[PDB]
Amino acid sequence: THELIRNAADISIIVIYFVVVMAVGLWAMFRSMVWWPIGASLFASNIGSGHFVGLAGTGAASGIAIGGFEWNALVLVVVLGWLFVPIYIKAGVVTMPEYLRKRFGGQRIQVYLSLLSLLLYIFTKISADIFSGAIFINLALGLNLYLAIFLLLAITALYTIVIYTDTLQTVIMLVGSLILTGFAFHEVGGYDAFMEKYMKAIPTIVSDGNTTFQEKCYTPRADSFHIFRDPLTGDLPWPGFIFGMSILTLWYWCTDQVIVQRCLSAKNMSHVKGGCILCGYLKLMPMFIMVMPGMISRILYTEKIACVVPSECEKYCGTKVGCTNIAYPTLVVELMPNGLRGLMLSVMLASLMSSLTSIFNSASTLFTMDIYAKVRKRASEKELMIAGRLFILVLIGISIAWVPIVQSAQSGQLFDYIQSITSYLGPPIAAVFLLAIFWKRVNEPGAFWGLILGLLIGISRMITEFAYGNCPTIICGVHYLYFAIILFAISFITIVVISLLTKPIPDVHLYRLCWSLRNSKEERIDLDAMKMKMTDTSEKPLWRTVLNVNGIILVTVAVFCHAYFA
């Protein structure tokens, strides 16, 4: 399986792709980004190889429900265009912790939230993406997982040396993924035959010595073709699904620095909205092109993807957890002709490079403006950039060192790992941002202490899970999309209360920083020609109405797809 791509013709495609990417990057190197590149880059930053691998694996093991996550992004993307980005533009902010500094004041909350978003990036993004790329390389090539990570990040470092490049990335990835989807669906015999054959993927080897595994452990779920699964016994329960995934997605899109940073570089508000719409329409695809291909991989490679014997799973992937995360790679490697196999390897690398370069740049911005600038108040621009570069290097090192914990991570389902860790560490951030933008009363001490409590609970559960890998069901037995809701509610209530206890932060410090005061001019007094254009969110009535209708139609399409897939 690993020797398939060794053909010279197949690798010709990857070298052509890399030459094209280098040419585009050099041309770009050698605020008017516009709607189609804004949306293309948002999609390419959101959809990395982490999504490919995790979504396909969770689709193989659990079914279509995981794909629904991506569709929720659609709705949240709409929010990002019409609720949060206008405020980030009016506030004239570059980073989100800088927005919280302007909103609340004081240095502790900015530093803390920057560090928390950096830890979130490290674990979820900079481990899942590199791990997924390593899976792709290891299944495609004999190189080990760690060596695969090393090669992948070397290639990414070459790649960085953005929105236009990410537009190329997303176009190539979308075309290649559509090609693979069509090819695999025809091979299985269409969607009807795919559904019929999917409820038969039971591996032949199901007993190890005298121990027989439970029937529900290895057979595909009866609800594998339903997004809304049982609230209690079904993995990814529908109430947890909707609410917890909406909270997590709110964090990721409307408060993470990467998405908002790429959304801010728009020429004007209309192109912000257009980029949001294009990214949403592109995000409507990742189900049909990542989840269903993984299910097809299960159908065609049941013994490899549905393994339940620890010995067999270990021999197939070196892990005794189930080999669930290698769904998409196998499909790409074993079912793709030489040229198309090379093209799909290029697609996976394209999505990964977009996501990882976006995250590297955003983390550099966060550490550069929100911590290093504060430690060295008189830092020169050159030293500032040097600090950012060293920070991304340290971030990469920490993420690589953290990879091994991601391997098992809830039975090898990488996307489950991503969503669980980010559910532990994101709901506090989402709560503070929602309250800050929508609630004037919140103040710096209250927000800081609410965040500290939320992080305390999240780290408590995370350490318990990592220690137990018999864990008490009263704490860890609840699915993490429900721990996300619990943590969000706890942080929300804590922030509200302790803010009502301490200080109002008068009212003249919240002009153009809160939703109620987004339009007031009133000579804002900060807690800490060109600018008039930068803080301008005016849009021509024609384009504004066109983009409003476009967003309504996009969310209509998202709801239609959700209901079509139950």
Partner: peptide, 28 residues
């Protein structure tokens, strides 16, 4: 209830939702 019945019903209810949202936006 075929899947496209569900899709159309969801489109209808969500369109009503957006219509109510814009109605309140105009009124509020």
């Amino acid at each position: 209830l075929q899947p496209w019945m569900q899709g159309l019903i969801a489109v209808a209810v969500f369109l009503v939702l957006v219509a109510i949202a814009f109605a309140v936006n105009h009124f509020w």
